[PDB]
Amino acid sequence: RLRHENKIYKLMCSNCSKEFCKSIYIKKVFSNYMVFDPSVWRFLHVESKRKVSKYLSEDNQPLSDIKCFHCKLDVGRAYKIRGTYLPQLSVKALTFVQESDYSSMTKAKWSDVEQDLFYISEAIEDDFRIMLNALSDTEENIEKKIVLDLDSRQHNKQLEMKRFHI
Amino acid sequence: RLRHENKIYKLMCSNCSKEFCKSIYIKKVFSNYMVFDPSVWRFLHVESKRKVSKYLSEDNQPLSDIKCFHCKLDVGRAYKIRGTYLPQLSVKALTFVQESDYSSMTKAKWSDVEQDLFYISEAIEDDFRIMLNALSDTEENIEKKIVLDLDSRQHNKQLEMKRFHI
RNA sequence: GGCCGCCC
RNA sequence: GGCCGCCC
Ligand SMILES: [Zn+2]
Ligand SMILES: [Zn+2]
């Protein structure tokens, strides 16, 4: 019965307060909450874990580690979904700030964000389209694509070599 | 029916391969797996999150972040249990290495470690005693105690000020 | 922050 | 790596 006003929030690093993106760029992909703002990568450091995920999916590859570019806090993980690299920001690494309300809060779960702060809808085709080529516009961002491509390649090889048993 | 041989393992940083401690120093405290080797702190970087845990316990305080001192990977969290500061290492940040077997493995859960690698028993009084003054022997370690004491102080104040409502 | 269970 | 539930 208690509905929020679905305001716009800034999503900030809870360690150094740098802003990653606005709330309206969060979209879900089957319970995975991802950022579909192509500018977000500028604010993220991408680094290989040098270990393939134990969850081996073709559609939904958990790949490189993502850190705040400023302070290097671990803020989530990059995925490859439907051929597209996407940042998944951890809700516990964020602070949500609303300017007009003069309010700032943390939340323990993304479902708490949806309940208390702002609505989050399912990502659709245009969201994947706008993110597909987001990493080819800055030298820093091109180096990040190299990491992701390498992790994705090893992920695919691990899945192929396990399927060799079957 | 399939029993392991309960060998000694080195617990190493999965990012940089620095050794934190031996397996025989892991002990559990009510499903929390902690390190009771007083030398381990030398290998850990302690940093305030500057945010009190949402789990407010008198007996079991989750406190400062712990990182590998060498490579700064997030490897767990420090707790205060029974008046004692203890490192809790994340099982997913470790690689387990057994020299005589010539073997090295990751595990996804501490219960998998117990099932496949080595037994882990409940911590007892002498374990807390040996850890009580582990942070007063190096300049680096004394600075770590300052962080922990500050986080514990704010934790206690947060719990006291919430209990003010009741 | 942790444990275990289920699911992706 | 994530989701949700329970527990510490
Ligand atoms: Zn930051
Ligand atoms: Zn390390």
- Residue B120 (CA) to nucleotide C5 (C1'), in angstroms, measures 21
Give the side-chain half-sphere CA count within 13 A for A56.
14
State the greatest distance between any 2 C-alpha atoms of chain B, in Å, as a whole number. Answer: 58
Way it was determined = X-ray
Identify any residues that bridge with B11 across adjacent strands, giving them in sequence order: B21, B96
Q: Which nucleotides of C are covered by protein (CB under 7 A)?
A: 1-5, 7-8
State the Cα–Cα distance between residues A115 and A63, nearest whole angstrom: 29
Give the full edge-to-edge strand order of the sheet including B60-68: B44-47, B60-68, B74-81, B84-89
Question: Which residues 6+ apart lie within 8 Å of B43 measured at CB?
Answer: B18, B19, B20, B21, B68, B69, B70
State the Cα–Cα distance between residues A25 and A36, nearest whole angstrom: 5
Phi, psi of B79 (to 5 degrees): -120, 160
State the Cα–Cα distance between residues A123 and A138, nearest whole angstrom: 25
Segments in chain A forming alpha helices (H)? 110-116, 125-131, 139-163
State the Cα–Cα distance between residues B113 and B106, nearest whole angstrom: 9
Tokens of B8: 């000694």
What is the nearest nucleotide to A90, using C1' and CA? D2
Q: Any CB–CB contact under 8 A between A74 and chain B?
A: yes
A113-117 contacts at long range (C-beta below 8 A, 24 or more positions apart):
A115/A4, A116/A4, A117/A4, A117/A7, A117/A9, A117/A23
Q: Tell me how long chain A is.
A: 166
- DSSP-derived pairing of the beta strands A10-13 and A44-47: unpaired
- From residue B20, give the alpha-carbon distance in Å to each of A17, B40, B67: 32, 6, 11
Residue B129's region, left for phi above 0, alpha for psi from -120 to 50, else beta, is alpha
Residues A74-100 as b or e (16 or more Cβ within 10 Å = b): bbbbbbbbeebbbbbbebebbbbbbee
Decide: A24 and A126 in contact? Cβ < 8 Å.
no
Decide: B148 and B85 in contact? Cβ < 8 Å.
yes
Distance, in angstroms, between A109 CA and closest chain B CA? 12
State the Cα–Cα distance between residues A141 and B106, nearest whole angstrom: 31
What Rg do the C-alpha atoms of chain A give, in angstroms?
16
Residues A140-164 as b or e (16 or more Cβ within 10 Å = b): ebeebbebbeebbeebeeebeeeee
Tokens of A41: 């990568």
**DSSP letters of B38-106?**
GGGGGGEEEE--SS--SS--SSEEEEEEEEETTT--EEEEEEEETTEEEEEE-GGGEEEEETTTTEEE-
Q: Tell me how long chain B is.
A: 166
- From residue B17, give the alpha-carbon distance in Å to each of B11, B64, B98: 9, 23, 13
Phi, psi of A147 (to 5 degrees): -60, -50
State the Cα–Cα distance between residues A56 and A79, nearest whole angstrom: 12
Say whether A76 sits in a helix, a strand or coil: strand
Decide: A77 and A25 in contact? Cβ < 8 Å.
no
Decide: A94 and A106 in contact? Cβ < 8 Å.
yes
Resolution value, angstrom units: 1.9
Identify any residues that bridge with A89 across adjacent strands, giving them in sequence order: A76
- CA B147, chain centre distance (Å): 16
Tokens of A9: 């929030």
Q: Whose atoms come closest to the Cα of B89: which ligand?
A: 2
Q: Where are the domains of chain B?
A: 10-163
Q: To 5 degrees, how large is the angle CA A157–CA A163–CA B3? A: 105
Decide: A9 and A117 in contact? Cβ < 8 Å.
yes
State the Cα–Cα distance between residues A122 and A56, nearest whole angstrom: 23
In eight-state DSSP terms, residue A107 is: -
Neighbours of ion ligand 2 (CB under 5 A): B 13, 15-16, 18, 68, 70-71, 73
State the Cα–Cα distance between residues B14 and A144, nearest whole angstrom: 22
CATH of B10-163, one of 1.10.3720.10, 3.40.50.300, 2.170.150.30, 3.40.640.10: 2.170.150.30
Decide: B41 and B144 in contact? Cβ < 8 Å.
yes
Token pair 């041989």: residue: B5
Report the first-to-last Cα separation within chain B, whole angstroms: 52
How is chain B split among helix, strand and coil, in percent rounded to 5? 30, 30, 40
State the Cα–Cα distance between residues A62 and A95, nearest whole angstrom: 24
Q: Is A59 exposed, middle or buried (0-12, 13-18, 19+ CB in 10 A)?
A: exposed
Chain B residue closest in CA terms to A65: B73
What is the nearest nucleotide to B59, using C1' and CA? D8
Q: Is A101 exposed, middle or buried (0-12, 13-18, 19+ CB in 10 A)?
A: exposed
